[PDB]
């Protein structure tokens with residue numbers, strides 16, 4: 001029940017040519033495009049009510065504050081948190097995950113404790129844990145993957161022990177398209193006395209998030225992936241855990257009393273927001289949320305399911321293409337052409353107007369698991385169409401034809 | 413030689429009324445306004461070439477990358493650094509100062525080492541040092557102020573000893589208007605074997621920065637104070653120091669190899685930029701720099717000197733007003749009306765259209781030093797005029813008249 005033509009009309013950037021062809025943007029997992037509602041929200045902020053926030057002593061100051069804290073409430077309702085105290089604005093999912101690793105992990109890990117992650121994790125959800133286990137002499141472990149790149153709950157029960165303090169796992173893999181059984185993993189973590197930390201950078205833009213239903217302890221997302229400004233994200237954490245964490249960063253705005261040598265902190269959420277905050281970006285993230293909610297996340301999810309089933313079908317009609325990951329998936333396809341390096345694939349597609357990704361996708365352990373150096377990836381969003389998937393598979397067909405010809409021509 | 417009318421024409425936000433009066437924005441030390449060149453830079457980015465950066469595999473990706481790294485070069489030239497490797501984009505001065513406290517201070521401080529700051533420092537340049545000395549068992553010391561809120565170099569030579577590892581000091585105080593003798597303090601620090609860390613949040617918008625001439629080891633600034641987007645700042649550090657610091661944050665983008673348990677880092681500057689970066693914000697900061705450079709920082713500085721000398725004169729014509737700090741100053745005046753709380757002052761000014769600040773200005777140790785709870789502050793920028801300073805002092809006169817009347821009327 002969504003109109004794709006009307007949705008595409010709201011995204012100015014879509015209406016242009018690259019190299020003579022109509023742009024075909026299939027790289028939303030790398031970053032999403034913004035509708036006018038979001039860009040005009042930033043314009044209006046800078047044109048009319050920019051001022052510093054949380055003073056409320058002059059009119060613009062009050063309007064800026066109302067917009068910024070108003071956006072916090074919009075985030076709270078968007079992921080179904082209980083309280084704005086549980087919503088911290090950060091620079092992005094990466095920073096959010098680093099805050100947990102710093103303030104939670106490095107304060108609660110002793111030799112013998114385990115942090116458990118998975119082989120499919122983006123680097124954002126790997127490196128902070130490597131550093132934290134190293135600083136504390138704890139142990140890092142990995143939940144194995146099944147043959148189709150999904151996670152077995154039995155493997156989770158086996159990897160997670162009563163020494164596990166943290167489970168950290170992706171909601172949705174940007175590479176495999178896997179949707180992980182987050183809710184069941186939260187119960188397992190909790191049964192062993194662990195917290196679960198969810199990397200929700202790739203789920204939040206594309207499907208309904210309910211932190212009450214997932215019962216996740218921490219949940220991280222990035223504005224830039226969900227039609228919102230760059231430079232902003234959210235750390236959600238259960239209020240009782242956030243209350244016992246020390247700040248990751250220190251400065252003005254996040255203090256209550258400052259003496260010469262000692263300071264006390266503001267209450268949540270401001271405790272974790274040091275310094276002048278990301279005012280225009282958070283307000284534009286609020287606009288992005290109003291925009292996605294007015295279309296409906298279920299509708300968005302339904303659209304992407306239809307794009308992904310269509311793409312999987314049309315890829316299986318191509319000879320000499322491998323697709324990675326399961327059948328039931330988020331709106332993306334990572335793949336390789338036999339004998340064409342994915343970098344060349346992406347380069348040739350760009351000559352056809354088509355924007356994809358090639359490389360390790362910040363998942364180098366997953367690439368080794370897949371037994372490859374690199375792959376190509378197309379990812380979908382609410383502005384993409386089946387016609388665009390046709391152009392993609394038609395271009396892959398011609399790419400295959402072209403590279404096979406060059407080779408035969410170079411058989412001189 | 414700058415035209416203020418033509419400069420004001422470029423700032424849409426200035427042209428409105430608040431409470432029936434023309435807006436008089438005198439709160440640029442809290443945050444600056446943006447010209448069209450900056451707002452349209454963000455529009456054009458989101459309307460035409462938003463994409464993820466540092467892949468350069470498709471056309472928009474390449475344009476986004478060229479804009480983002482192009483902005484890095486603009487920052488480098490703007491502060492006269494030697495290399496883009498010395499320019500890290502961060503969330504703001506606060507984050508920048510926290511990075512030094514985390515990666516430099518907490519790795520190089522042992523019991524017996526001193527970190528030396530001053531009583532005039534913003535919280536951003538206090539709390540990170542409090543935490544770092546506490547984590548390492550080092551010692552925090554404070555350079556005293558003279559009676560006019562300036563720093564004596566003799567006091568610096570006395571506070572800084574051969575156990576001092578870090579001197580951290582404001583370039584320009586947001587409260588006193590003091591311009592600190594940064595260059596001479598760098599020599600003293602260096603003679604004792606210390607590094608100097610400069611908080612340049614309040615200097616960078618308003619006067620020419622030359623990190624070669626200052627010989628500062630680290631220098632921090634915020635976009636939002638200098639006509640640029642919120643949410644972005646810079647950490648400059650001498651390349652040889654940055655090369656020996658570990659990252660403050662870990663994740664994708666800032667790695668080279670990721671194994672299961674160990675990782676290696678990118679070269680500078682990317683080593684310190686974890687995760688998708690502040691793409692649109694950094695590009696708009698580049699626009700802000702082109703805009704300020706086209707007016708000329710010396711011209712901006714000259715204008716503010718004339719506003720500040722005018723304001724100091726016209727304040728001294730008011731009865732029962734105290735102004736804090738020295739005669740030679742940056743473009744701002746912090747003050748109190750005898751017997752009117754600064755909060756009431758700022759509230760009454762807003763009813764006249766006039767936007768100032770009241771409170772501790774994130775300098776609680778300085779407020780105790782001044783022997784007050786709070787003050788009011790007006791701050792100037794390149795769009796402000798002497799007519800606006802007249803309205804301010806006329807309004808302070810009427811505020812004084814009004815509060816004195818209420819009191820006499822309440823002498824019933």
Ligand SMILES: Cc1ncc(COP(=O)(O)O)c(CN)c1O
Nearest residue numbers: 275276504505506534586613634
């Ligand atoms: C002197 C000074 N130092 C530090 C800061 C903190 O900068 P930010 O809030 O942009 O991180 C400010 C901000 N008004 C400042 O004026």
Ligand SMILES: Cc1ncc(COP(=O)(O)O)c(CN)c1O
Nearest residue numbers: 092093094122174201222687688
């Ligand atoms: C699954 C996943 N996790 C983490 C990240 C890192 O997010 P950011 O770069 O926005 O910090 C991404 C970003 N593409 C992602 O897709």
